[PDB]
C-alpha cells in the first residue's frame, strides 16, 4: 500500500500489489488480486511511504469486490482504504507481518507516469508562506530607507500619467 | 549633600508578551537584568539576557527541570552540592509554532 502519494484524496491510499490465499511461503503460487505497479512518487513531494502488510487467515477468503482487472492502470480503480479492507475481512485475517520503505522521485517515475499510467507527470514544489510585515504607516518613524521596499509589489518604475 | 547619583531612570526590565499572546519571529518576549525567565523551545537568548521568539506562534510559560551546561563551573558546583532527592526547577518561556513549515503546491504538468 502506498500511504502518501494519492493526488486527489489526502486520506486515501494506493494499491500496488495484492496477493491472496498464499499457501504457506510460496507467494508466487498464490493468486494475485492486484498486479504489481512500480512506485510513482511525484517529483515535488518526496519520500513517500510504501507498506507491506501480511495477514494470516484461517479460512480461504474469496471476494469479488476487491478484485482488479488485468491492466489495472486506473488511479480511480486503484484507490484503497486499509481500514475499510480490514473492517470488511476482520473475522478471518490477522496482521502478523510488516515491511515499509521510503521512496522518492527518480528518473524512472516519469517513464512510469507516461508509458503505464498514460498521463502527464505532475511537478510540485515546497513553497513557503510569504514573510510577515506590519501594517504600513503613513510616517514610519526612525525606519530605514528600505522600509518602502517591504511593501513594493514589483521592482519596476511605474509612471502613472507620464 | 553626602548621597549623590541616586537618580537614574528605570530600564523597563520586564515581561513584554504574556501567555497566549500570538507573536511573530523576532518579537522580544521579555527583557531582564538577571536570569528570571529562561528561554525554551523556539525562544532565543540575546547578549543582554533578553528573550526573543524565533518562530511565529503562541507564547507559553512552564516550570521545568534545570540541567546546566557541564562547563558552567558555578552551576555544576551547585548541582554537585544539591542533596540526593533535590531537582532544580526554573520558569521557561516557549513559543509553540502555529503555521506549518511549508506547503507542496503544483506548478506545472510535464
Amino acid at each position: 500500500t502506498n500511504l502518501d502519494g494519492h493526488l486527489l484524496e489526502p486520506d486515501a491510499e494506493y494499491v500496488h500489489w495484492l496477493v491472496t490465499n498464499i499457501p504457506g511461503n510460496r507467494v508466487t503460487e498464490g493468486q494475485e488480486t492486484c498486479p504489481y505497479l512500480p512506485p510513482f512518487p511525484a517529483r515535488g513531494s518526496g519520500f513517500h511511504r510504501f507498506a507491506f502488510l501480511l495477514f494470516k487467515q484461517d479460512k480461504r477468503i474469496d471476494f469479488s469486490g476487491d478484485t482488479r482487472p488485468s491492466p489495472c492502470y486506473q488511479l480511480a480503480q486503484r484507490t484503497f482504504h486499509t481500514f475499510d479492507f480490514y473492517k470488511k475481512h476482520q473475522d478471518a485475517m490477522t496482521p502478523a507481518g510488516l515491511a515499509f520503505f521510503q521512496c522518492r522521485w527518480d528518473d524512472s517515475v516519469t517513464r512510469v507516469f507516461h508509458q503505464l499510467l498514460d498521463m502527464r507527470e505532475p511537478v510540485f514544489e515546497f513553497v513557503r508562506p510569504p514573510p510577515y510585515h506590519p501594517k504600513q504607516k503613513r510616517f514610519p518613524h526612525r525606519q530605514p530607507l528600505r522600509y518602502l521596499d517591504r511593501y513594493r509589489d514589483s521592482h519596476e518604475p511605474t509612471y502613472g500619467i507620464y | 549633600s553626602k548621597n549623590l547619583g541616586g537618580k537614574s531612570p528605570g530600564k523597563r526590565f520586564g515581561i513584554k508578551k504574556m501567555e497566549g499572546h500570538y507573536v511573530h519571529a523576532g518579537n522580544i518576549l521579555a527583557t531582564q537584568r538577571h536570569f528570571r525567565w529562561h528561554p525554551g523551545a523556539h525562544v532565543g537568548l540575546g547578549k543582554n539576557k533578553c528573550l526573543y521568539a524565533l518562530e511565529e506562534g503562541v507564547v507559553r510559560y512552564t516550570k521545568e527541570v534545570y540541567v546546566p551546561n557541564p562547563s558552567n563551573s558555578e552551576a555544576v558546583d551547585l548541582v554537585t552540592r544539591l542533596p540526593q532527592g533535590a531537582v532544580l526547577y526554573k520558569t521557561f518561556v516557549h513559543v509553540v509554532p502555529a503555521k506549518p513549515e511549508g506547503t507542496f503546491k503544483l506548478v506545472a504538468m510535464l
Binding site: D4, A76, Q102 | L106
Partner: peptide
C-alpha cells in the same frame, strides 16, 4: 479529459519523516 488528470493542487504529505528527510 483524462479521468486520472485530476491533480488537487493542494498536495498533502502525511509522512512524519518527509520534512525531516528533506531537511
Amino acid at each position: 479529459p483524462v479521468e486520472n488528470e485530476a491533480v488537487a493542487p493542494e498536495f498533502t504529505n502525511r509522512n512524519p519523516r518527509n520534512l525531516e528527510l528533506l531537511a
